[PDB]
């Protein structure tokens, strides 16, 4: 545990815009067993609204006025956004895991409901990550702490992934549910092998050798935070999974050509699976 | 210029929610000579609104409604947010610099208006970066492209920095303006030497040895995107500066203990200086 936290009279959650004196954390958050996250404040809000409807229950922002992130709560589930990229995700992760610790919450499941680029699967596919790796296909998150290199192993809650897959096989979703590996990259364009950024120093041949090699190593999609979420939660005593929809088949192209409406439809598909899971696993109270 | 863009009949700006077919880019953006950016959509909008008032001109969002980023324009200035951290900033950088390319804009100045942790300066101090380095004080942005390590030199437009410093002396700011080095970190907590994250593997003494050393190497503040902005712009034919206020003295602590109201006042100080600069040098029409 971080003993330095005891030195504080009050802990200011800078990016959520509240402090430990804002509410009673044990009373307020003590019953939380799940945290659902994604890059979009609007989308995670909508998801929380859907969970409230399922709970038979407005879903009001718990975060303060000038916060970078939103925070909602529906029964035993916390909802937060985390922007895009490992650094932004680590800001959310630090402050939410502190919150959870202060509330007395242990062994919480974090669920990332994101969007991603697919490898060898159709757009709209749900990929359940069975491992999260960097762009060198290594299951580690890399950090530089006090100027020194550190690596933290990525651990996916595989027992839960398998339960979700089994669940999906018994459901009627309008998409395939693929279990496979997930590359987290530190950019949307060049690090993801895109030819269509403002800069590109490689050929299509080199792009496809990179992506096809990843495919052969079991990778089925690519996003920007996976290695942060699945390394940090384990180290703070929690569990984590990634449930991402694909928005493009990167073996065919780079551009996101589907409509805004179609993208929104696709992005809601992880929530449709996960929502029923949460319902069956005491995420909400069925009223 | 990326030759592969000519392989697109249409170029979708995914995170801005429009396309090359959405506008006549030459007609709409051709006059842009400045891009002001920061992590907050609300704060960059308020700054654009302030520049609009200066120009004597509602500032409407140009980006799509379901977009990750906002985009505004006041005369020759473009405004956008970029979230927090290098990956997010790179997303804005690629799409905005493509936009400028399509619009025929050349030698544009990117201005990041951020907040930061200070080293040995008082909270509310404006730091003008005269270099942007990683946590090892190296003037490079690091990338892993097709799984291979790539480094890109950071280049701050120093001529503009010097002009800003000189300008600030002639203004009446309630703060000091310091030219100094800026560290970009891939985290707010552990990578910035904070003792107050959910994980900490070091002591107060190890924190202070690390930051005091950086101070001695001329670092005066610390944020999360400097190396991306100052390496990317140069390589795409543009210029870039960082103008960041400090919200805490990291040699004294980690927590941001100033009120939300004071933080907001502080966060507006970069725009106050930069706006005077843009007003003098053809950012707007008065
Ligand atoms: O990080 C990503 N998010 C969403 C995508 F569609 C993609 O290709 N990459
Ligand atoms: O990246 C940062 N932004 C703002 C701060 F106050 C800080 O310490 N670090």
UniProtKB/Swiss-Prot annotation, chain A:
Gene3D superfamilies per record: Nucleoside phosphorylase domain
Disulfide bonds: none
Presence of keyword Glycosyltransferase: yes
Pathway assigned in UniProt: Pyrimidine metabolism; UMP biosynthesis via salvage pathway; uracil from uridine (phosphorylase route): step 1/1
UniProt GO molecular function: identical protein binding; uridine phosphorylase activity
Keywords attached to this entry: Glycosyltransferase, Transferase
GO BP, one annotated term: nucleotide catabolic process
Binding site for phosphate: 39, 68, 112-115
InterPro entries attached to this UniProt entry: Nucleoside_phosphorylase_d, Nucleoside_phosphorylase_sf, Uridine_phosphorylase_euk
Binding site for uridine: 116-117, 192-194
Gene Ontology cellular component list: cytosol
Catalysed reaction equations from the record: uridine + phosphate = alpha-D-ribose 1-phosphate + uracil
EC number: 2.4.2.3
Biological role: Catalyzes the reversible phosphorylytic cleavage of uridine and deoxyuridine to uracil and ribose- or deoxyribose-1-phosphate. The produced molecules are then utilized as carbon and energy sources or in the rescue of pyrimidine bases for nucleotide synthesis.
PANTHER family, alphabetized: FI09636P-RELATED, URIDINE PHOSPHORYLASE
Family: Belongs to the PNP/UDP phosphorylase family.
Subunit (UniProt): Homodimer.
Name under which the protein is recorded: Uridine phosphorylase A
Species whose genome carries this gene: Schistosoma mansoni
Lineage: Eukaryota, Metazoa, Spiralia, Lophotrochozoa, Platyhelminthes
